[PDB]
Amino acid sequence: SNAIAVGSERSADGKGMLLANPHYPWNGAMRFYQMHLTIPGRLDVMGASLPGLPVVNIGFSRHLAWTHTVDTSSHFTLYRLALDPKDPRRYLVDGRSLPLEEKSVAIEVRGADGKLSRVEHKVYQSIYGPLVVWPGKLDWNRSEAYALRDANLENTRVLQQWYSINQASDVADLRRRVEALQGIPWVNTLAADEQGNALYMNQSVVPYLKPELIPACAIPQLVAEGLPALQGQDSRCAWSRDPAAAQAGITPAAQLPVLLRRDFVQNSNDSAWLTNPASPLQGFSPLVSQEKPIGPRARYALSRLQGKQPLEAKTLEEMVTANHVFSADQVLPDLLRLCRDNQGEKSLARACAALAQWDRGANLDSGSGFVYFQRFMQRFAELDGAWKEPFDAQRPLDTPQGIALDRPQVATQVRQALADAAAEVEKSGIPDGARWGDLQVSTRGQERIAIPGGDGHFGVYNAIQSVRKGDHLEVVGGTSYIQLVTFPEEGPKARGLLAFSQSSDPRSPHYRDQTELFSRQQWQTLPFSDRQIDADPQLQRLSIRE
């Protein structure tokens, strides 16, 4: 997901502006749905929501627009159990042996013959929660097991939280409402208001451990691999309690990252750290936010956002619709010169030609160079010390950069990587005259619609994830509900689309209508005022009661 909030100091109109570009599945239980909700006099909000949830998840109201992105904070901890040496169904806390609880669930299963069988399954639970097994990493043997404590299992506030957000007036009110309830499970919140405030909040439900306990309570090897793992044999490693927190064992709001500015804030799924590089967010618990290298989507956004120039609505729109493969900026110049050094190489010719002709984009009309680039990058990612300029914490916006071609081994390995990528591409048997839009599609009935965009890991702001199905790449997730909100005098102006359309049902008139538009990248008014709604020639009305 991407989010950009722009304030009074940077917007062309001196007022707030928000780009919401959440990246979600195109099917299933997290498929967004557009709706506008009004209880006249006290609720008037529009945006998108998730299946079965009667509140707006991402949206806007008269003076406010907000969105969310998945954060990097932990929302659970694993606990390594020290098992009772005499009994692997018992575990030690402060040297005292405790029994696991056994909870059986019963499931009905439909067999080939069409009849139901009952299956019973035992779920083992510790004081922390259920045991979990990852064979070869988190085993359950005679020495240890792992239990999982999920912080959101006790979060009964989640629905109230979004209902409250839906009632928020401006950025200050939104901040108050979220900090007061702490009901947001696992996302950042970014927002802008008419007065030109831009807000970033890493305000979610995060396990709390006081600073002094982290060194002793962490499992070092597992934490080093990105898992929030704690010592479950020591009662002192229970989540800490702080009366200010809305829920026992979670981090109080004052200790979670917030940035309130009048220029901009952004997030593309990295930590709070470089939300705005002018004001870095630092000194938080590692369970909350770490100073880790930013992904290429964020690096891309910051490269377009840094500076003094006014930001227009058009600018933010074009950051999505340009489909620029930003990762090419760091590697493609040096790759092309390797290509020019190896023109006598038969196995490289087609790749090098396709890469040289490529527009560095993931547009419908982008050439096969994008495919060659993707397969090369999957191999480049595996090489050691291949960056000319490796990540520099002092230069977090401009590194890593370039290929270390002057180093003999790197040159060999990068050439081999390109040779192997080219082999993979040409083995797939697709023609060279084929463009990206000929490959990446969304099926609608028996028909297919070409879809622009590409994987977020290659720095395409318009992130689209796809998989091989038949002869094409079938879109499964990415750019979903798009909303770009400004605040001119008459009321909020919202512009966007729901990429996959309102209805998942092939029979609906709204199964593919916005998907055709998404393909052509033609965003539309999201009508919010009675005037805008009334102006729509497609307007239909039904009143219902029982």
Binding site: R31, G52, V133, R541, E546
Partner: protein
């Protein structure tokens, strides 16, 4: 009663629901959503109820790409009656009303559906929903940043035998 909503649709089938209270508001949302997505919600409720193997057998998967039986075990565990009741008990009157109205609005569409925008008419898993079903969906989503990511791992956790 209390169940009354006014719905306007603009281009692309975007609904604009107006009501005097949360119960009416939910009524409109559930009805509008069902018109577009009855089959989707019905399927995902089967998943959140842990009844995929019952309707579809052990060979299939959920839309999250989990095997039906492990998915069912996980949701049966997550959405036990005691857990749903505690969750419901903690909800404000406003949220309870939104959910109540939502379930009624969805069910109203189901009573009237003739297949015009519903491809799964006649399937046994397409049925009237309850507020508990909405709670099941909410909790499913709630744990997506936590234990839901370890669904397979939870199902796989069994104590060792007599091995070396």
């Amino acid at each position: 009663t209390g169940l009354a909503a006014d719905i306007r649709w603009t281009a692309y089938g975007v609904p604009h629901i107006r009501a005097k209270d949360e119960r009416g508001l939910g009524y409109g949302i559930g009805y509008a959503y069902a018109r577009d997505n009855a089959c989707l919600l019905a399927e995902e409720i089967v998943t959140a109820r842990g009844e995929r193997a019952r309707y579809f057998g052990s060979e299939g998967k959920s839309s999250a790409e989990l095997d039906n039986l492990p998915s069912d075990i996980f949701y049966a565990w997550l959405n036990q009656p005691e857990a749903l009741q505690a969750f419901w008990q903690a909800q404000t009157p406003a949220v309870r009303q939104l959910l109540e109205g939502y379930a009624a609005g969805f069910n109203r569409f189901l009573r009237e559906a003739d297949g015009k925008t519903t491809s799964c008419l006649g399937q046994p898993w397409l049925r009237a929903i309850a507020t508990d079903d909405l709670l099941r969906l909410t909790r499913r989503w709630l744990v997506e940043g936590g234990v839901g990511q370890f669904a397979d791992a939870l199902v796989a956790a069994a104590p060792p035998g007599a091995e070396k």
